[PDB]
Amino acid sequence: VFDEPVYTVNVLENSPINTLVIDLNATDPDEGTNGEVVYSFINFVSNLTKQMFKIDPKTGVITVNGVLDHEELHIHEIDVQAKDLGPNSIPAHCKVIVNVIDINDNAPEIKLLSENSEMVEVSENAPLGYVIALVRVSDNDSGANGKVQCRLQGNVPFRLNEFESFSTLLVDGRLDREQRDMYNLTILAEDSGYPPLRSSKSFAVKVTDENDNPPYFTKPHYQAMVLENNVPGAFLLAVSARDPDLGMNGTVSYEIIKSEVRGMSVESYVTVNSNGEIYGVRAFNHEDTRTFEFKVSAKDGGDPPLTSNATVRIVVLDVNDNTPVMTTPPLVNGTAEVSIPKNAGVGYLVTQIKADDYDEGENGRLTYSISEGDMAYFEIDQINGEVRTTKTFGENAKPSYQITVVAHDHGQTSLSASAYIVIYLSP
Ligand SMILES: [Ca+2]
Ligand SMILES: [Ca+2]
Ligand SMILES: [Ca+2]
Ligand SMILES: [Ca+2]
Ligand SMILES: [Ca+2]
Ligand SMILES: [Ca+2]
Ligand SMILES: [Ca+2]
Ligand SMILES: [Ca+2]
Ligand SMILES: [Ca+2]
Ligand code: NA
């Protein structure tokens, strides 16, 4: 018969094999008994127990024959028997209990609930306290060996809120992609064993792009000078807008706003390249339009897209592309007849010549001269065009005088237009 009915023993988790759990004696014959004892396990409460322990059948010494895992099973209940060969006897049997004492063999486990596994992401300037990923820390031991706290690290714009079940990782700042497209976090964790076993976990935070900026122009108002009578399809000016966003959000497409210039349309005067290049679609003419301005848009692919527009002033410069035009006196094939008294004095105003020129400035300025003919008997004012007599006529003066007035301008190469004034002396 066994010394005690029930035995309780504490055994370290993960104790090596052949560790002495206990040496039982079935009270080997006291004052005699038939003798030749034999020990054996006859039953286990959990069958798992079968494979963790062993007993010498003759000496009666229980030892470890397996890995005692507290997280698997912590209590082992063994029914054991001692026998005298059944000559004329009963079997004695007691109940052994091995408590598996928990030790700190599991350190913390840090897990991220997100969709794209391990790719944590968040859109620019997402709001303060916007949850990005649920983190879950665990330690599979019991007690202090099971308890755990964890913390973010280094200054970053995020934080964690510890809860009963799990923690939560959220935004704690303003995120701008144009400034930073990524952060590099490290969650540090540890258990409360002695000494405490620690875990780190490092991972990335990809800040996803928003279409939060439009294409910025280099200038709000561009200007360019052109020369009059330019060729159709001749380059004028380049504008440029850049968008800091990603892809479609940041591509740039140029458009010219509908406007009418002098009664038609911008298109009919000007067009735009999808590269910010402005081409003259027509031959410009300073006498029609010395200046016109227009707006030019820029847009990007986003839902919905965004715009910036800039103004464009075109200065049309003057060239001397208008020869002057004789308009007084009226002209037949470019000549006029006038009459005058023969006894006319000196200074008599014969006629007054005048021309119009459309160009502006020097290009448009007129000077009058007698080019040829009876330049001796008449004189012309350089600015008026007033033709007057410079001599008296009498006694066998010819009765008819021919003079060629011209009006020329002041351009790089001066243009001009003549007229033939015939003078007849009416007595
Ligand atoms: Ca274990
Ligand atoms: Ca353990
Ligand atoms: Ca632990
Ligand atoms: Ca931004
Ligand atoms: Ca952006
Ligand atoms: Ca944009
Ligand atoms: Ca012109
Ligand atoms: Ca002119
Ligand atoms: Ca002109
Ligand atoms: Na023994």
| 283 beta partners | none
What was the experiment behind these coordinates? X-ray
Cα–ligand 2 centroid distance for 10 (angstroms): 14
Which one, of 357, 350, 370, lies nearest residue 411 by Cα?
357
| 15-40 b/e (C-beta count within 10 Å ≥ 16 → b) | beeeeebbebebeeeeeeeeeebebe
Which one, of 365, 374, 350, 351, lies nearest residue 407 by Cα?
365
Based on its alpha-carbon atoms, the radius of gyration of the chain, rounded to whole angstroms, reads 56
Please tell me whether residues 27 and 69 are part of one structural domain: yes
The verdict on residue 24 lying in a domain is yes
Query: Which of 208, 243, 264 is the last residue before a domain boundary?
Result: 208
Please tell me whether residues 242 and 293 are part of one structural domain: yes
The verdict on residue 354 lying in a domain is yes
Region of residue 325 (left: phi > 0; alpha: psi -120 to 50; beta: else) = beta
Ligand nearest to the CA of 3: 10
Ligand nearest to the CA of 322: 8
Work out the end-to-end distance of the chain between its first and last CA atoms, rounded to an integer number of angstroms.
Answer: 179
Please tell me whether residues 259 and 193 are part of one structural domain: no
The verdict on residue 397 lying in a domain is yes
Q: 56 CB contacts (<8 Å, ≥6 apart)?
A: 39, 63
Tell me the C-alpha distance between 402 and 335, whole Å: 10
Cα–ligand 3 centroid distance for 104 (angstroms): 4
Cα–ligand 10 centroid distance for 303 (angstroms): 84
Please tell me whether residues 43 and 77 are part of one structural domain: yes
The verdict on residue 193 lying in a domain is yes
The verdict on residue 240 lying in a domain is yes
Cα–ligand 7 centroid distance for 289 (angstroms): 9
Ligand nearest to the CA of 247: 6
What residues flank ion ligand 7 with Cβ within 5 A?
285, 287, 321
Cα–ligand 9 centroid distance for 262 (angstroms): 17
Please tell me whether residues 79 and 119 are part of one structural domain: no
The verdict on residue 241 lying in a domain is yes
Tell me the C-alpha distance between 272 and 281, whole Å: 10
Please tell me whether residues 227 and 291 are part of one structural domain: yes
Query: Which of 60, 85, 101 is the last residue before a domain boundary?
Result: 101
Cα–ligand 4 centroid distance for 120 (angstroms): 18
The verdict on residue 1 lying in a domain is no
Please tell me whether residues 12 and 92 are part of one structural domain: yes
Cα–ligand 3 centroid distance for 72 (angstroms): 15
Cα–ligand 4 centroid distance for 310 (angstroms): 22
Residue type, 34: N
DSSP letter assigned to residue 66 = S
Ligand nearest to the CA of 411: 8
- Do residues 207 and 177 touch, judged by C-beta distance below 8 A? yes
Please tell me whether residues 80 and 144 are part of one structural domain: no
Cα–ligand 10 centroid distance for 58 (angstroms): 8
Please tell me whether residues 92 and 165 are part of one structural domain: no
Kind and range of the H or E element at 8?
strand 6-12
Determine how β-strand 92-101 pairs with β-strand 6-12: parallel
Question: What's the CA angle centered on 249, arms 246 and 250, to 5 degrees?
Answer: 65
Please tell me whether residues 159 and 204 are part of one structural domain: yes
223: Cα within 13 Å, side-chain hemisphere:
7
Tokens in use for 208?
Answer: 């996803």
Tell me the C-alpha distance between 206 and 394, whole Å: 109
With 0-12 / 13-18 / 19 or more C-beta atoms within 10 angstroms meaning exposed / middle / buried, residue 53 is: buried
Q: What are phi and psi of 217, to 5 degrees?
A: -75, 155
The verdict on residue 117 lying in a domain is yes
What residues flank ion ligand 1 with Cβ within 5 A?
69, 71, 105
Helices vs. strands in the chain: H and E counts, helices first: 0, 33
Q: 347 CB contacts (<8 Å, ≥6 apart)?
A: 388, 389
Longest dimension (CA), the chain: 195
- Do residues 17 and 106 touch, judged by C-beta distance below 8 A? no
Tell me the C-alpha distance between 332 and 422, whole Å: 12
Q: 71 CB contacts (<8 Å, ≥6 apart)?
A: 106, 140, 141
Tell me the C-alpha distance between 65 and 70, whole Å: 15
Tell me the C-alpha distance between 418 and 186, whole Å: 93
Cα–ligand 3 centroid distance for 197 (angstroms): 6
| 12 beta partners | 101
Cα–ligand 6 centroid distance for 312 (angstroms): 22
CA 390 to chain CA centroid, Å, is: 83
Residue type, 42: I
Cα–ligand 3 centroid distance for 198 (angstroms): 9
Ligand nearest to the CA of 26: 10
Q: What is the tally of structural domains in the chain?
A: 4
Residue type, 55: I
Ligand nearest to the CA of 103: 2
Query: Which of 176, 208, 240 is the last residue before a domain boundary?
Result: 208
CATH of residue 330's domain is 2.60.40.60
Neighbours of 61 (CB within 10 A): 16
Give the CA dihedral 42, 43, 44, 48, nearest 10 degrees.
70
DSSP letter assigned to residue 332 = B
| 199-225 b/e (C-beta count within 10 Å ≥ 16 → b) | bebebebebebbbbbbbebeeeebeee
- Do residues 282 and 375 touch, judged by C-beta distance below 8 A? no
Ligand nearest to the CA of 229: 7
- Do residues 370 and 404 touch, judged by C-beta distance below 8 A? yes
Ligand nearest to the CA of 306: 6
Please tell me whether residues 232 and 312 are part of one structural domain: yes
Residue with tokens 């000559």: 87
Residue type, 82: A
Cα–ligand 7 centroid distance for 318 (angstroms): 8
Determine how β-strand 307-317 pairs with β-strand 221-227: parallel
Cα–ligand 7 centroid distance for 361 (angstroms): 13
Domain of residue 39: give its range.
6-101
- Do residues 57 and 48 touch, judged by C-beta distance below 8 A? no
Tokens in use for 233?
Answer: 């399809």
Ligand nearest to the CA of 106: 3
| 326-364 b/e (C-beta count within 10 Å ≥ 16 → b) | beebeeeeeebeeebeeeeeeeeebbebebebebeeebb
DSSP letter assigned to residue 230 = P
Please tell me whether residues 159 and 143 are part of one structural domain: yes
